[PDB]
Scaffold this motif. Structure first.
Motif, PDB file in Angstrom:
ATOM      1  N   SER A   1      11.938  32.270  44.969  1.00  0.00           N
ATOM      2  CA  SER A   1      11.691  30.763  45.515  1.00  0.00           C
ATOM      3  C   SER A   1      10.280  30.776  45.604  1.00  0.00           C
ATOM      4  N   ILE A   2       9.634  29.666  46.027  1.00  0.00           N
ATOM      5  CA  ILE A   2       8.320  29.321  46.650  1.00  0.00           C
ATOM      6  C   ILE A   2       8.495  28.427  47.766  1.00  0.00           C
ATOM      7  N   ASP A   3       8.255  28.992  48.997  1.00  0.00           N
ATOM      8  CA  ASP A   3       8.611  28.539  50.036  1.00  0.00           C
ATOM      9  C   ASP A   3       9.484  27.358  50.395  1.00  0.00           C
TER      10      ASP A   3
ATOM     11  N   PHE B   1      12.919  25.904  44.629  1.00  0.00           N
ATOM     12  CA  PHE B   1      12.842  26.723  43.568  1.00  0.00           C
ATOM     13  C   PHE B   1      12.012  26.227  42.561  1.00  0.00           C
TER      14      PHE B   1
END
Lengths: 252, 252
Positions: B233-235, B238
């Motif tokens: 994930s990115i913060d 997705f």
């Protein structure tokens, strides 16, 4: 070589429906999947150590802080086809490191677990030190790390060293200044994948800016190729309240 | 050998603050970090292809469905130090595969992109087929796959083959029955890490039981060691609305 550190969260009934029994498969499968040469593990009671041996593919070196083999402990997992352990030991982070004891500043017995390893392909050994410093105070952390650095001074001076684990300290604490006299923080040396922080308190939706940066991989005598914080999840939960932290390194 | 397939989500203004411009770094860094031998990519307009070439470490084979080089396309990313491409091609999933066209049952032109590769160490070639079947209907998917299997019948018969991509079909559809005459679904052949499903619709908190299983890695002439769906994930978001799907395979 790929290496990692992972605080897997001590088995405690405080975690209720997310105590170790419910998390063990996810934690062990994560370890098996990432399949590093070695991994430092923090916060394992004897049952958790047994589970790591049973459900991961790794050889397990372990020691615990009570001395009676019943307490919370540390482990170093390693793959013997990739690295061989040629020496190991542990000691208390106290004024009497060879006996179960508590530092004057600390709230409980703490140990360090170390191993001298050799990569299958290389001829020169390297030192791994598994860190878990006291949460009670910055003074306790500085004091504990002082014992590590003194007790292993000769080995650290002699070998390339990986100082890895849960420092319980954000980057600005005195303990990091002490460590940085001899070591470099690997995550500033190359490309870093994932969040820079590592502690999410089991909060799946925790904003990255709110992660605590308390786990570290410090290096002496290594080239760092990359680092990562691993955000693997299990259906809307994290297997531990820390992310694993990994590095790829090469000897000098 | 590690291989993967990843539908990276077409650049569209419908995604608003999560259109490609905002996601490109996360997608490319994921690809760089996982660092497979090769990865089939779906849903890339020309700007996305440019970004994959610029921001990943991979060599990029690509083709697009309009024929004018301006349409939505497919790519195969590969690392030349690990595998070499000795032949490549593409065709339309229609009654006239050599020219831009639409199958009677389909809603738009669709292509398949393939490559004949050799691992650096191995002597014999293998075939990679990048799949992205029509979303419009089960009949369109069966029809599209029929064209692939016919058009590449000779190559598939001759070589170990990796049939990888977005089938737009859950496991019970007729298209899977057809494919299973010659291929096996890799995720049932060994240990699978992560969710069995791959489509989350950009919903970070999507329950795993609610993921759609529409991406596949089918194998012919391979030993499968492991498979995984990657939940990077990115913060709290997705990088795509699909998870990448990866496999570890070995030639026979």
């Amino acid at each position: 070589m790929k290496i990692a550190t992972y605080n897997v969260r001590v088995d405690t009934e405080y975690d209720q429906d997310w105590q170790w029994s419910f998390r063990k498969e996810a934690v062990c499968q994560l370890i098996n999947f990432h399949d590093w040469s070695l991994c430092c593990i923090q916060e394992v009671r004897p049952n958790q150590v047994r589970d790591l041996k049973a459900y991961t593919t790794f050889t397990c070196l372990s020691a615990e802080r009570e001395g009676d083999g019943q307490g919370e402990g540390l482990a170093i997992l390693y793959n013997e086809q990739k690295v061989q352990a040629i020496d190991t030991g542990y000691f208390w982070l106290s004024e009497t490191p060879q006996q179960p004891s508590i530092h004057p500043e600390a709230g409980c017995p703490r140990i360090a677990l170390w191993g001298l390893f050799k990569e299958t392909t290389q001829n020169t050994p390297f030192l791994v030190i598994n860190v878990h410093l006291d949460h009670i105070s910055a003074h306790a952390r500085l004091a504990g790390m002082t014992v590590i650095l003194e007790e292993l001074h000769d080995k650290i001076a002699q070998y390339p060293t990986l100082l890895m684990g849960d420092f319980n300290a954000e980057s600005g604490e005195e303990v990091h200044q002490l460590v940085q006299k001899k070591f470099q923080d690997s995550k500033n040396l190359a490309t870093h994948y994932g969040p820079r922080g590592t502690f999410q308190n089991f909060t799946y939706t925790k904003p990255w800016a709110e992660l605590e940066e308390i786990d570290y991989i410090y290096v002496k005598g290594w080239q760092v190729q990359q680092t990562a914080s691993l955000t693997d999840s299990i259906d809307g939960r994290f297997p531990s309240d820390h992310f694993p932290l990994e590095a790829e390194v090469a000897g000098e």
